[PDB]
Design a protein around this ligand. Structure first.
Ligand code: W0F
Ligand code: ZN
Ligand code: ZN
Ligand code: ZN
Lengths: 67, 49, 257, 48, 44
RNA sequence: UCAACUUCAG
């Protein structure tokens, strides 16, 4: 639903890298090159960003219960 | 490398990222125990479920 | 009949990484030092959360989980802080904990990214490794998150939120000479980065009298503790565990006498 | 123990209320067992 | 108590034994609104 | 509450 803080396998903080990853993808970088630029090295950490599905954006479309 | 002792495991081990699913069957929903609980009216035997 | 004298050579030292080599040491000692890196180095992390208002899409305990996983600078005061169990005061106090506050509302139309920067600490030494930022939640307009949190000292054996390190790379015998791992086809196997072999030779010749020594470590910090001080604190903590064990052992031996 | 005449039903045994319990819902209502309804039908026809 | 309206998201106070209809919108789905007492969550 | 139905588990 939202990018997890810390990769499950090792624990490196991946929560701060999702917006940068999306921006680098917008730039032109391939997924692998963006992952390298963000500093993700082990495939455990690259799985976190590469496989992430951001549903929080779809859930934010619904109006809040209390405004 | 063995986690407990640090020695290399002699047989090299197949590791990779595989997709796993968490099925709805969980132990907390299944654990049950009975000891002189409620009893049916007709049979006067322990209840079901 | 006595302990060997180990030697350390630090190859790389960066704000995020320490690559070092320990020579003339046992495999058990080396592995347990790595194990203490992972699980027995004290750190500061959020362990008490009280959410006054959470209208975000994520439920309260989801927010609490994410807050706990956020790293917090624990370089100096983690040694000064006491465990909550040790502290005499009831619940939590400045000596046993650090207080954080979050008061974010998305008044604007554009989505508000609540980050670790929005967490405000009562003591300046502990900050959420902000000096991007870890994203706690995204808030739509009209959605508000308010909470108070308390961060306590602890180590990774309790919970992975207290792990000071990301990945501890531990390698010994880079070229297989003790045959601790027996390759079915040695040539297919990639050379290690620490390997000194020529490209033609897949494995070093079997050393019958050899013993695992010259262990190579790469310790990556999570940012809470400096990677150097992770290793130093681990060595000191293992020594303290051994000394406590010796004290209790001496007491029980005296009792038996 | 068994005479052939006794096989023909001249007296119908009505089982005790233990055999045919009254199913109570919320105290608002008391459903009756299938046996109670069938016995009610038998009593009605017998009275007729 | 005070019930937040399902549609117009305006808090309305409805007494007991009173029909559940928000004033000014008429929606018939209300929500109880979060409790004042606070619950401690271990971040674990 | 009880009967019925369906869906699952091994
Ligand atoms: C091995 O035999 C068992 C038992 O006989 C018992 N059992 C299961 N279903 C039934 C049933 O409907 N009726 C009756 N009476 N017994 C039943 O289950 C059988 C196997 O079934 P399976 O073949 O699916 O076992 P996997 O080979 O599939 O095991 P995986 O790798 O998933 O763990
Ligand atoms: Zn990882
Ligand atoms: Zn205290
Ligand atoms: Zn309304």
């Amino acid at each position: 639903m939202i990018i997890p803080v810390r990769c499950f396998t090792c624990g490196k903080i991946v929560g701060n890298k999702w917006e940068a990853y999306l921006g680098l993808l917008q730039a032109e970088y391939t997924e692998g090159d963006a992952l390298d630029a963000l500093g993700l090295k082990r495939y455990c950490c690259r799985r976190m960003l590469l496989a992430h599905v951001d549903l929080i954006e779809k859930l934010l479309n619904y109006a809040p219960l209390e405004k | 490398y063995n986690g407990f002792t640090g020695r290399k495991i002699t047989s090299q081990i197949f590791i990779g990222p595989t997709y796993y699913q968490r099925l709805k069957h969980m132990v907390d929903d299944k654990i049950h125990s009975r000891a002189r609980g409620p009893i049916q009216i007709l049979n006067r035997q322990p209840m079901e479920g | 009949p006595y302990a060997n004298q180990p030697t350390v050579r630090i190859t790389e030292l960066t704000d995020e990484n320490v690559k070092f080599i320990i020579e003339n040491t046992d495999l058990a000692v080396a592995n347990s030092i790595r194990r203490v890196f992972i699980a027995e180095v004290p750190i500061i992390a959020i362990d008490w959360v009280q959410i006054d208002a959470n209208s975000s899409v994520l439920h309260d305990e989801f927010i609490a989980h994410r807050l706990g996983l956020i790293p917090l600078t624990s370089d100096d005061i983690v040694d000064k802080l006491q465990y909550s169990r040790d502290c005499t005061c009831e619940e939590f106090c400045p000596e046993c904990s650090v207080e954080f506050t979050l008061d974010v509302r998305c008044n604007e139309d554009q989505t508000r990214h609540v980050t670790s920067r929005d967490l405000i600490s009562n003591s300046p030494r502990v900050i959420p490794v902000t000096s991007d930022d870890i994203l706690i939640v995204k808030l739509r307009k009209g959605q508000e998150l308010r909470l108070r949190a308390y961060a306590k000292k602890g180590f990774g054996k309790e919970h992975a939120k207290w792990n000071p390190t990301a990945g501890v790379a531990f390698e010994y015998d880079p070229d297989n000479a003790l045959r601790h791992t027996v390759y079915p086809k040695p040539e297919e196997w990639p050379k290690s980065e620490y390997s000194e072999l020529d490209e033609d030779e897949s494995q070093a010749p079997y050393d019958p009298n050899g013993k695992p020594e010259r262990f190579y470590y790469n310790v990556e910090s999570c940012g809470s503790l400096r990677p150097e001080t992770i290793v130093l604190s681990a060595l000191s903590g293992l020594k303290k565990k051994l000394s406590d064990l010796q004290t209790q052992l001496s007491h029980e031996i005296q009792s038996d006498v | 123990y068994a005479r052939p005449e006794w096989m023909i039903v001249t007296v119908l045994p009505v089982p005790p209320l233990s055999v045919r319990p009254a199913v109570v819902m919320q105290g608002s209502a008391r459903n009756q067992d299938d046996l109670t309804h069938k016995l009610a039908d038998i009593v009605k026809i017998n009275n007729q | 108590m005070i019930y937040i309206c399902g549609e117009c998201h305006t808090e309305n106070e409805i007494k007991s034994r009173d029909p559940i209809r928000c004033r000014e919108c008429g929606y018939r789905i209300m929500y109880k609104k979060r409790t004042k007492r606070l619950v401690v969550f271990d971040a674990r």
